[PDB]
Amino acid sequence: PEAFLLFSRRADIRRISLETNNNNVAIPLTGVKEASALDFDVTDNRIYWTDISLKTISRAFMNGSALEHVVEFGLDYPEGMAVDWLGKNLYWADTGTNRIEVSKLDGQHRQVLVWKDLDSPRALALDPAEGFMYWTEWGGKPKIDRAAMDGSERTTLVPNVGRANGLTIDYAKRRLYWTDLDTNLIESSNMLGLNREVIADDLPHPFGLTQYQDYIYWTDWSRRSIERANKTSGQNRTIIQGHLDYVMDILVFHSSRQSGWNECASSNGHCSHLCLAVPVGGFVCGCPAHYSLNADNRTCSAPTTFLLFSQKSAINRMVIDEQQSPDIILPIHSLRNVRAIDYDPLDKQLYWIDSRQNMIRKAQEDGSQGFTVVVEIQPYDLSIDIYSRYIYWTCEATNVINVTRLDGRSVGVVLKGEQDRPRAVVVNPEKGYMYFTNLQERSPKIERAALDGTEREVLFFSGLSKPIALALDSRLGKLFWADSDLRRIESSDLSGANRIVLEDSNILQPVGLTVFENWLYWIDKQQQMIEKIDMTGREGRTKVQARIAQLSDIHAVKELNLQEYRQHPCAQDNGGCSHICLVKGDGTTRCSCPMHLVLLQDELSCGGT
């Protein structure tokens, strides 16, 4: 049961012994470029650190085994990090994104705690036995804030300080210690921001700070050393090591620094996801980002309706909620060049086209179960038949409308021609039609056809130049498309009649659009905007979000109605067909086949030759 001192310096997490104060060894870790915030766990003797050059937070034991990245997306530059050894949680403060967030110890169930009016949080300290989390801010007005470990009751604890760092709690004396970089001193205070006392002065830049027994340790970048002193008086001043320049964070490694208890206990407080400590040693059950707490106030629920907007190397998700919750990045690996997106509301899998790999890949929302559906070929846009469970995707290299199952089993080609150039495509299985843009030169067309390639007809051909995106909404019975050359967004009924222009101003490069309730969202790559127009016409064009580079596609997802889906005839056993099952207007259900096959005499299976 020995206490050491862990500190970070460049790419090294170096360890100093406090008894035989001579052992200087480094923690056996590889791949670290720059180490920053430090904290550990008393249960399994893990060491946790933040890497602000790789934008990751990684974890491992004291031997380098089980080296893993628990937080790897959505980080800018976080040097605030602390461990909840009781509730088995992780908190961190990111300065670039201005967010104090939360997740489990393995990196799952990511939730944002503080995202409003937060100006660069840094040093983070935790008091889980009492239910408080303390952190520092610089920026405009440097101050030290207080809040519960769930994001509520945020208060300004110490208003008049300089740029502070190295926030450490002495859990025995009920006091809070911190350094000050502008007034050049180290000072203390009780657990509620007052009774402030300066311990030592004339430190031109005390960056790090920690506490153990009657001794506080700090590092000053001017003196290039780690020092020890009496925690309350400042006497008995000794040097631990010299020639150590620019330590990013120091930490006392001992089991008494992480004692106490709370009501989360060993059963996670019987919460489904997160156990977040609140006053009176109590707890509340937290939920990941965009999840809501149910009525029982112990279980969480995923969002039933939400929107997905993608970038070149990142897929995002935002909800319209009255909490005004922020959007998050979906932890999907190997995202390279996403061109278009679509979502399956049944098995909760997100699909996309990576134009640098020429692949159609799928994965869960949390990143697991990554699978390549299609892998020369050059996909461009996709639209999912969520009923029959099969995908329509257009290939720009062969200029065909090709059909592929969700598992990757090829079905066949339903549309091909010498002059045809199918690009954007959206399906409407509720009525048995598919819509697609036909980008023939100097004669662009918007056509439609049945789900097998026959019954082809041209809907609109005039008034078009570069129809680059397509979408529809079966409830409203409307077809929407954006023109990046004429700079306008238009509308029309699902039969070709009632063609109107919804907006033709302040449009530059609309590469995507979708319908969410009575709102038409679209994305502008050049203007870097997500905006919306009310279809009812009572409200005006409203800005949603700015500062989003490399926009590609957007897709809204409504909750899947259990009764409406199963009452579709092709939903069960694909309607008994071997390939294509399409709804016909006369109320009956008919099987069909691609263009290189013929429907056999049983009117269920297909044949060749």
Partner: protein, 1030 residues
């Protein structure tokens, strides 16, 4: 009519001035009886003892920038999340007024810096209000000698520690300075800047083109190449050099000045621009130049978009046609930058497209084959008006070059501090965050600090040092001026010139290629620079050995070397002796003591009660800390208690070796001088009396206060006595340091013994200074023939071995020439006649690199015996007799002008210029004059085979003007208050130090009929209304 007998008597006058009045015969016996130690060294041991010194000076200096690197390296990995979010400034702060250390400016330096605002300042996230002060103050306190510390961010805020006010008259843009351009992009740029005047470019539109063309040249470095071209019906480059019309010349200080005056000298023409021929010549220049080590090549074009009448896109065809053929012939290495000169709309939107296609080299638009299989370097295009910042737009062309992520320290050559002080040497290294650039850090140090161990080398009397680099540029050599005195030095000087000597180019090979080594060579005595002749230790030699030992300065691109003349002959230095001071030691700082009955001796604080002693900057363990830091009364007492310390209890307060030993060996002059003063009859003729040593000791009587930076080892009387061992050396007339005006000096060397009387065995010289008219008062009293008439047609005169007259009937004149005291201006006919006597007059051309000039001077044969009379000229109208004064370097001569004769020697009365700086003739008479340069700024050699043994060894020695102060000038009288107007005849006023014999009235040439003696303040040079020589 005799002349030899008059020379024996006038020579006994010289010995009485040296033996009795100065004490040479006594001090030669005192140093003859002292015991010395001996060394025989080939330079192998001394080279690594001195390489041991400066290598640790560079290691501590590299450990500052490697520190300040890991400072800023950690100052982004932390400040990507711990930024400033604050604002400060570099002015509006009225304390300071300290001028401490090298920072001779207002400087608080209470661990606080400042932030100089650029124009491209926004929000972003960088240096935390320079919270770096935490470490910056530690750096300044823990490493004395360093000067400035600064950080120029990529954003543009210029932050420097410590804080001072340095040109708040505009904006201090550092990203467009030569410091920050050659550091982030250390590769050599081959730039040509093409200017567009003509096609009726307006004057405000031309004013932007000439201001921006002068921001580019003020931002590059000499390892680059530049050639600016003008284009208007014809292409004419700078018409000020030969290789400007052929090659690209490096961008030194001399090329920047010529190329910028060729700017603003061009005014708007009217013919069509003629674009295509302007680019075809810029490639013909880049082609002819060498590649020489990593090179990028760029062309900048400053136009407004010019068309003709029916050749608007046809001449556009011809421009992008030669861009494909010429740049394709160069493997597409050239990059093209274009800047538009728009104002009010004179340049439309279509002429912007013509300057777009030039930067991108968009040749396929105008139908060109473009058979260049290799891609083209895509250039940029920027717009300008009279409101744009020309430092952040045109000055930032270097961001368009490939950044190869070079992370190596770059060492700069000395340059003037842009912050309001003298000379600086700066090393800088870029700063990377993975692949994101941050800016650079830089540590400024005084040039005198880096070189203090090689500029003040006083170990052996047989050796001297010099510092070089890889390609041979001399950073220091005894032929250069001390770094502390300079204003802007010409570093562009190879050692093949300073150490020019036959068979030196063979040793120059092994020094630049081998890390270390040693080597001896044999050189004849004649055809050798003086530094080797002043250190010979065998009498009567025809050739001599020299040993060179060199070694690289580790972890940098510099090389040190030790020169030892005659390594086999033992060199002696004074053994440690401990004589008790018979007369107590008085340090020369009389302003800090004030205890003696003080008085004023010319422009000096002095005393007549006891002589003083001086320690030059070279005597201390740290010469820079003695020159920059003030010297307090406490420092004088530690030095006085240690120099006269007969015991060995007082520790060394900061002196070198052999410093206290040469003070205890020369303390015997205090008894000689005080005894002679009271029994001498020349108390009113001698202005002072002094002795000097090579290790920096200077004893003077009357003991006077001198400037701290005064070095007697660099004066002419000292350098002239060592060249003539044992002989009495007459030096002058020369301007005295103590403000005594023009004086004449008798100097003589004293040796370790007497069995060995060579130049190298000189351990000290003695000197005694007289007045200008004294030696003409001696000729009239000693030699009766001179008084036959009043110095009109029968004139007597004394000449030194350089041609100057220390005694002459006429004194001072149309207030000119400058070299008026030379024989060529006062006696023209003798000069033409003595140039014809063979083996007696030698004209010398030495090369002085200090002020980039070549000096002319005469050297008379000091070993002549017998008379010299008229041989060809002056056979009728002007008889002459010239002979040598025995045992000295002076000559006595008489002229008998019996009939008028007209003779001329060209001597400038406005400058010093020679008439003809093309050739030099032996028989062409002209007073000592100069010629600028005989080199070429193209290859770096001598135009003619001017491998003369040169090195005039500065010998210019920039005369200062250190006065005293008002209010104290009138509170004291003259020391020797020799009341002037109580002297009656000319024989009693000539030679008195603060008097002068007034012969001319206050109006030119009016002989006043009552010549009286007066304080010299009244009548200067004889005219009672004449103005000051100063």
């Amino acid at each position: 009519f005799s002349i030899l007998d008059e020379a024996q008597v006038l020579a006994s006058q010289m010995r009485r001035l040296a033996a009795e009045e100065l004490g040479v015969v006594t001090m030669q016996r005192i140093f003859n009886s002292l015991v010395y130690t001996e060394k025989i060294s080939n330079g192998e041991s001394e080279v690594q003892q001195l390489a041991k010194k400066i290598r640790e000076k560079f290691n501590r200096y590299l450990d500052v920038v490697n520190r300040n690197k890991q400072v800023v390296e950690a100052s982004y990995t932390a400040h990507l999340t711990s930024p400033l979010t604050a604002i400060q400034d570099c002015c509006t702060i009225p304390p300071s007024m300290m001028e401490f250390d090298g920072n001779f400016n207002t400087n608080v330096s209470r661990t606080v810096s400042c932030d100089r605002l650029s124009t491209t300042v926004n929000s972003r996230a960088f240096n935390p209000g320079r919270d770096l002060n935490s470490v910056l103050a530690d750096n300044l306190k823990s490493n004395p000698g360093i000067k400035w510390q600064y950080f120029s961010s990529e954003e543009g805020i210029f932050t420097v520690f410590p804080a001072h006010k340095f040109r708040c008259k505009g904006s201090y843009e550092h990203r467009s300075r030569p410091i920050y351009v050659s550091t982030v992009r250390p590769q050599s740029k081959h730039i040509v800047v093409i200017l567009d005047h003509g096609a009726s470019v307006t004057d405000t539109q031309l004013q932007i083109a000439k201001d921006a063309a002068q921001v580019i040249l003020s931002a590059i470095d000499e390892h680059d190449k530049i050639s600016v071209l003008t284009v208007a019906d014809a292409v004419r480059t700078c018409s000020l050099d030969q290789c400007y019309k052929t090659y690209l010349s490096p961008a030194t200080s001399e090329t920047k000045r010529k190329m910028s005056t060729f700017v603003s000298s061009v005014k708007p023409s009217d013919s069509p621009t003629q674009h295509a021929v302007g680019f075809h010549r810029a490639f013909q220049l880049i082609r002819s130049t060498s590649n020489s080590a990593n090179t990028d090549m760029v062309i900048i074009y400053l136009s407004a978009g010019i068309t003709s009448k029916d050749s608007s896109e046809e001449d556009k065809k011809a421009t992008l046609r030669v861009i494909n053929e010429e740049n394709g012939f160069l493997n597409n290495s050239v990059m093209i930058l274009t800047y538009a000169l728009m104002n009010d709309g004179v340049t439309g939107l279509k002429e912007l497209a013509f300057l777009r296609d030039l930067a991108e080299q968009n040749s396929g638009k105008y139908g060109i084959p473009d058979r260049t299989a290799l891609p083209v370097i895509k250039g940029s295009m920027m717009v300008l008006n009279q409101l744009s910042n020309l430092e952040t737009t045109v000055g930032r062309f270097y961001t368009n070059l490939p950044n190869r992520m070079i992370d190596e320290a770059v060492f700069s050559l000395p340059f003037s501090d842009e912050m309001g002080d003298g000379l600086i040497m700066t090393v800088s290294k870029p700063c990377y965050f993975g692949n994101l650039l941050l800016g650079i850090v830089g540590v400024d140090v005084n040039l005198a600090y880096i070189l203090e161990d090689v500029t003040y080398y006083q170990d052996s009397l047989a050796s001297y040092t010099f510092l070089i680099d890889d390609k041979g540029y001399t950073l220091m050599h005894p032929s250069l001026t001390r770094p502390y005195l300079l204003s802007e030095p010409p570093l562009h000087t190879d050692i093949i010139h300073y150490e020019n000597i036959p068979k030196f180019e063979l040793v120059r090979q092994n020094i630049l290629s081998l890390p270390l080594g040693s080597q001896i060579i044999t050189v004849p005595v004649n055809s050798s620079l003086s530094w080797h002749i002043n250190k010979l230790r065998e009498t009567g030699k025809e050739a001599y050995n020299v040993s060179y030992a060199w070694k690289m300065v580790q972890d940098t691109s510099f090389i040190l070397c030790i020169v030892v003349i005659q390594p086999e002959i033992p060199v002696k230095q004074l053994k440690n002796l401990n004589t008790v001071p018979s007369s107590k030691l008085l340090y020369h700082r009389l302003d800090l003591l004030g205890q003696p009955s003080a008085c004023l001796h010319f422009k000096q604080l002095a005393t007549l009660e006891s002589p003083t002693v001086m320690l030059s900057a070279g005597s201390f363990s740290s010469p820079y800390e003695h020159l920059s830091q003030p010297e307090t009364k406490r420092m004088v007492e530690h030095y006085t208690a240690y120099l006269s310390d007969n015991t060995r209890l007082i520790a060394n307060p900061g002196l070198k070796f052999s410093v206290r030993n040469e003070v205890m060996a020369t303390s015997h002059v205090t008894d000689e001088w005080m005894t002679q003063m009271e029994m001498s009859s020349l108390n009113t003729y001698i202005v002072r009396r002094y002795i000097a040593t090579p290790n920096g000791v200077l004893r003077i009587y009357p003991g006077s206060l001198m400037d701290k930076a005064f070095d007697p080892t660099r004066r002419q009387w000292y350098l002239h006595a060592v060249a003539n061992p044992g002989l009495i050396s007459l030096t002058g007339p020369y301007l005295d340091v103590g403000g005594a005006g023009y004086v004449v000096t008798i100097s003589h060397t004293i040796h370790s013994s007497s069995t060995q009387l060579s130049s190298g065995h000189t351990v000290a010289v003695m000197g005694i200074d007289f007045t200008l008219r004294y030696f003409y008062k001696v000729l009239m009293d000693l030699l009766p023939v001179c008084n036959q008439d009043g110095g009109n047609k029968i004139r007597c005169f004394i000449m030194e071995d350089r041609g100057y007259l220390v005694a002459h009937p006429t004194l001072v004149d149309g207030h000119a020439p400058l070299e008026q005291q030379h024989i060529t201006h006062k006696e023209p006919l003798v000069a033409n006649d003595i140039l014809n006597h063979p083996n007696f007059v030698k004209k010398n051309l030495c090369n002085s690199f200090s002020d980039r000039t070549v000096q002319r001077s005469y050297k008379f044969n000091t070993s002549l015996v017998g008379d010299l009379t008229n041989l060809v000229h002056g056979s009728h109208c002007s008889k002459y007799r010239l002979t040598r004064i025995p045992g000295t370097n002076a000559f006595v001569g008489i002229v008998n002008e019996t009939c008028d004769s007209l003779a001329f020697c060209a001597c400038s009365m406005v400058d010093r210029l020679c008439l003809n700086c093309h050739r030099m003739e032996q028989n062409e008479c002209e007073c000592p004059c100069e010629c600028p340069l005989e080199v070429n700024e193209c290859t770096g050699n001598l135009t003619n085979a001017e491998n003369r043994n040169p090195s005039c060894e500065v010998h210019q020695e920039p005369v200062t003007y250190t006065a005293i102060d008002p209010g104290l000038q009138d509170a004291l009288q003259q020391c020797v208050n020799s009341r002037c107007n109580q002297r009656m005849e000319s024989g009693d006023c000539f030679g008195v130090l603060d008097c002068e014999w007034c012969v001319v009235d206050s109006d030119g040439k009016t002989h006043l009929d009552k010549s009286y003696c007066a304080p010299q303040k009244e009548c200067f040079g004889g005219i009672v209304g004449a103005k000051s020589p100063y």
